[PDB]
Design a binder for these strands. Structure first.
Ligand SMILES: [Ca+2]
Ligand SMILES: [Ca+2]
Ligand SMILES: [Ca+2]
Ligand SMILES: [Ca+2]
Lengths: 219, 211
DNA sequence: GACG
DNA sequence: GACG
């Protein structure tokens, strides 16, 4: 049975940040890739890496963080507080929320955000970020799900579950453009398309309200 | 230097229900915003995109059906966009576009291929029906066709293949061709910037495609 | 042209 | 572990 009905659109979501949870990191890059459920509802071996649906909305943004990028974040992601400021990137701010709001508003409701390790990373982090704003959270009315739980579940029914490992186990290919918000969100879409009807249903079953996610750290 | 140095280039691409004759409406819109400073052999390797870009890509339900030609080459149709729940070109889109523009240093200059004859007049027509003040007012625009001529057929693909001695990909998706456009524009970035600064014109002076 |  |  379904806790909240059928999610009308899935939003694959990926972030880059200044470091790992222990460093109370900040967002530096954010990608959203909105897909309607019909899009998710395969010939050959190894299985062709699936084409993205023809109809998707994509938002990819760069974000000046209020603190330095740890050296680790800098070398994996290719970003730095200093370069984003050279390119005049604005921070995680009220206008970024209206933007998110308007972007989310264009999607059939309700939404379900899907991030890889989202339960331990992107969600709580996004939650922390948004809590600083005075604009109402534009996420409070969405649902979320962590695609590590999904892939486990799905593979089980037919080992490492990091992004690339799964993508490589599934497709016998290397993921491209790793650690760019968009780059890795696409690879995430690829593995979620592995069994669309099965993932799509696993999502409906496990979706939970974003507002019940705890912030990574406090103010 | 009529309008100072553009701080942001926003490469712009659309899909639509057809060609100007048919009074088209927009079905797909893609914006690729690159800061000025992320723009400052043989055959030349296709250039890479800068690490820092902002991208917005949206499918839009048109009010009129697609012409058979527009469906053919774009893979889109009113019915599909609708059944998949795409909203119209509405006030919220205007609010979204604007929020996106607000994140860039000014002045922004739009860049589109044959934009003076297509995209710009088309967008202006779409935006004139809205109660929101246009988010594009105060922006600048330029036609990458004039740009590429001045720098050197001038179809998008012709140019790409002529500069990089190889084939484009992902045609007639708003994003597919916006990326292509990005490449040929970075063939000679510095020369491009200088020409853009020189020929940029206020979007708000662009006549509507139709009324 | 050259844009869909 | 897995997220940067
Ligand atoms: Ca991630
Ligand atoms: Ca990543
Ligand atoms: Ca075009
Ligand atoms: Ca196109």
């Amino acid at each position: 049975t379904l806790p909240h009905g059928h999610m009308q659109t899935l939003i694959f979501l990926n972030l880059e940040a200044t470091g790992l949870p222990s460093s109370r990191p900040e967002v530096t890059e954010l990608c959203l890739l909105a897909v309607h459920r019909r899009a998710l509802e395969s010939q050959g071996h190894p299985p062709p890496v699936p084409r993205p649906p023809r109809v998707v909305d994509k938002l990819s943004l760069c974000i000046a963080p209020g603190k330095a990028c740890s050296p680790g974040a800098s070398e994996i992601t290719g970003l730095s507080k200093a370069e984003l400021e050279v390119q005049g990137r604005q921070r995680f701010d009220d206008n970024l929320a209206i933007l998110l709001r308007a972007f989310l508003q264009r999607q059939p409701q309700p939404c379900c955000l899907v991030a890889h390790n989202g339960d331990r990373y992107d969600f709580p982090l996004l939650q922390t970020e948004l809590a600083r704003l005075s604009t109402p959270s534009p996420l409070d009315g969405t649902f979320c799900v962590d695609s590590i739980a999904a892939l486990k579940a799905l593979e089980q029914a037919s080992k490492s579950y990091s992004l690339g490992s799964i993508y490589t186990r599934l497709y016998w290919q290397a993921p491209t453009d790793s650690h760019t918000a968009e780059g890795d969100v696409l690879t995430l879409l690829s593995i979620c398309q592995w069994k669309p009807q099965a993932l799509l249903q696993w999502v409906d079953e496990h979706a939970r309200p974003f507002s019940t996610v705890k912030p990574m750290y406090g103010t």
